[PDB]
């Protein structure tokens, strides 16, 4: 018995599915018999539910009630819904979590209350939903963390309070809900949090504080051992303090960009054995290379716009498993070995005060593919410096003070860049440089030596 206007189908065995989606109903359907296993009412102008709700369909897995602009759910509305598993109450115009519509609804796992105009969450509204694992409370007008009602949600594993207007997170704001694995608080107005907010969830693995207004680094992060992912970008932090992520080993990825970060601790990024990625742009007060003990499996390290002086002798010892390095736009004069730091694939050291290239400084980089040393003060190259880099294909020494050019090894690449090097005038052959297709030269006369009088810009 499919209701009028609607679309029906058998679920698994003989249970029935009623689709009453965008049909623009006035009220929910009458009739609509038992055997019904999930029910969709979306975008259909439902003011009040109802003069006659419809409980007693004891087999209903799922009600979807999104886009219906109701203002308030009376209590007994969901009583007979004994097998309710997922209830959706999205983009409706609720102003508060149903004071009592939502309780002792035993078997429900996911409750979706986003895109409403909810502002206050009543205490013990969530009394007796010991199965709720998924909760939406985003795109709403919350003002604080509803600590009260949240306790009874100890089965909660994933929650989102994104896109609200919460500004402060009190201590123990999430006391009991230790089952929580995913917490989402982005696009809010979070300025300050307590020293002991996050101490509740011992099973939290992901955290989202992105697009918010915090001024200082959240030190409450320290207590979340199991945390794997963390994001606090597009905020207003000034600096990462020493031993910031000490309390969170087994962190994989971190997000903090578009934040006016100025100082980063030396040891701030120590002991994160599985950390894979890094990018640090524009940290001026950084005068030191950061310590990376116990963090040896990074693959991409880039540190720019600072005032580093030079690198420690054995710098790369802490750093295997990486492939890309970018230490551009700093005050680098002397250069380390780079030898041990194998498997390197791409390097960028432009705009440094490097006056020289020693022999070993790029020795035995069998994986190195790209080397950029443009805009430096490189007066002199020891000839065998490049003797040992087969995998090298693109090379730049632009805007330098070079007079001659080394020759050993090297032979066989794709890019070679040499402007600003006016002291370079002598020729170079197509032979001992085949497969070269894109080229720059200080003077036009040497470019045609490669047949342009393939690309080559004088």
């Amino acid at each position: 018995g499919c209701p009028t206007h609607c679309h029906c189908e058998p679920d698994g065995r003989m249970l029935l599915r009623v689709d009453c989606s965008d049909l623009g109903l006035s009220e929910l359907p009458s009739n609509l018999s038992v055997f019904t296993s999930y029910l969709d009412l979306s975008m259909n102008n439902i003011s009040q539910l109802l003069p006659n709700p419809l409980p007693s369909l004891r087999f209903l897995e799922e009600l979807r009630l999104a886009g219906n602009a109701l203002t308030y759910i009376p209590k007994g509305a969901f009583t007979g819904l004994y097998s309710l598993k997922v209830l959706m109450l999205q983009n409706n115009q609720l102003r508060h979590v149903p004071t009592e519509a939502l309780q002792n609804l035993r078997s429900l796992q996911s409750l979706r209350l986003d895109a409403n105009h909810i502002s206050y969450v009543p205490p013990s509204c969530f009394s007796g939903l010991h199965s709720l694992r998924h909760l939406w409370l985003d795109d709403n007008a919350l003002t604080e963390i509803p600590v009260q009602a949240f306790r009874s949600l100890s089965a909660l594993q994933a929650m989102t309070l994104a896109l609200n207007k919460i500004h402060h997170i009190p201590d123990y704001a999430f006391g009991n809900l230790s089952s929580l694995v995913v917490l989402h608080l982005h696009n809010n107005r979070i300025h300050s949090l307590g020293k002991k907010c996050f101490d509740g969830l011992h099973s939290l693995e992901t955290l989202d504080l992105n697009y918010n207004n915090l001024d200082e680094f959240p030190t409450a992060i320290r207590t979340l051992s199991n945390l794997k992912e963390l994001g606090f970008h597009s905020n207003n932090i000034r600096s990462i303090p020493e031993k910031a992520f000490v309390g969170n080993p087994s962190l994989i990825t971190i997000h903090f960009y578009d934040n006016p970060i100025q100082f980063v601790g030396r040891s701030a990024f120590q002991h994160l054995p599985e950390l894979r990625t890094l990018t640090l742009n524009g940290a001026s007060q950084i005068t030191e290379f950061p310590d990376l003990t116990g963090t040896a499996n990074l693959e991409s390290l880039t540190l720019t716009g600072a005032q580093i002086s030079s690198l420690p002798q054995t710098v790369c010892n802490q750093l295997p498993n990486l492939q890309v390095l970018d230490l551009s736009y700093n005050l680098l004069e002397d250069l380390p070995s780079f030898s041990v730091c194998q498997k390197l694939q791409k390097i960028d050291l432009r705009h440094n005060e490097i006056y020289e290239i020693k022999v070993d400084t790029f020795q035995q980089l069998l994986s190195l593919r790209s080397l950029n040393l443009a805009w430096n003060k490189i007066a002199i190259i020891h000839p065998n410096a490049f003797s040992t880099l087969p995998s090298l294909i693109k090379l730049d020494l632009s805007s330098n003070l070079l007079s001659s050019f080394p020759i050993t090894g090297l032979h066989g690449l794709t890019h070679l860049k040499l402007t600003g090097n006016h002291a370079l005038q002598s020729l170079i052959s197509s032979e001992n440089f085949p497969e070269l297709k894109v080229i720059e030269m200080p003077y036009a006369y040497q470019c045609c030596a490669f047949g342009v009088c393939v690309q080559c810009s004088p």
Binding site: S42, G67, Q90, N91, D114, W136, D139
Partner: protein, 104 residues
């Protein structure tokens, strides 16, 4: 243009959604098309932003439906779901699985 859609191109379908809805993409033969949904179909998860709300493909191994990323809401059969993730074992901290596939 379409029901609950603000901007429509004859090439792309829906480009933008009515205030509080979700855009659904599909790349068909190196062509993408957009439709607007009050919520997403299975296999994705619902992501809101003040710029765009989009139904996003769930980048998880052996997962049918999800909440956000790195958290699965329902896993695929023969595989069990432990705290949003999916495994055949599932510790040994002390979990164990009932007549369904939902270890505690």
């Amino acid at each position: 243009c379409a029901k609950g859609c603000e901007l429509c191109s004859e090439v792309n379908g829906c480009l933008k959604c009515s205030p509080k809805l979700f855009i659904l993409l599909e790349r068909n033969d190196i062509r993408q098309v957009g439709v607007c949904l009050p919520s997403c179909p299975p296999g994705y998860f619902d992501a809101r932003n003040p710029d765009m709300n989009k139904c996003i493909k769930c980048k998880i191994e052996h997962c049918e439906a999800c909440f956000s990323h790195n958290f699965c809401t329902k896993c695929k059969e023969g595989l069990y779901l432990h705290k949003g993730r999916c495994y055949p074992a599932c510790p040994e901290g002390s979990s164990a699985a009932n007549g369904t596939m939902e270890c505690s």
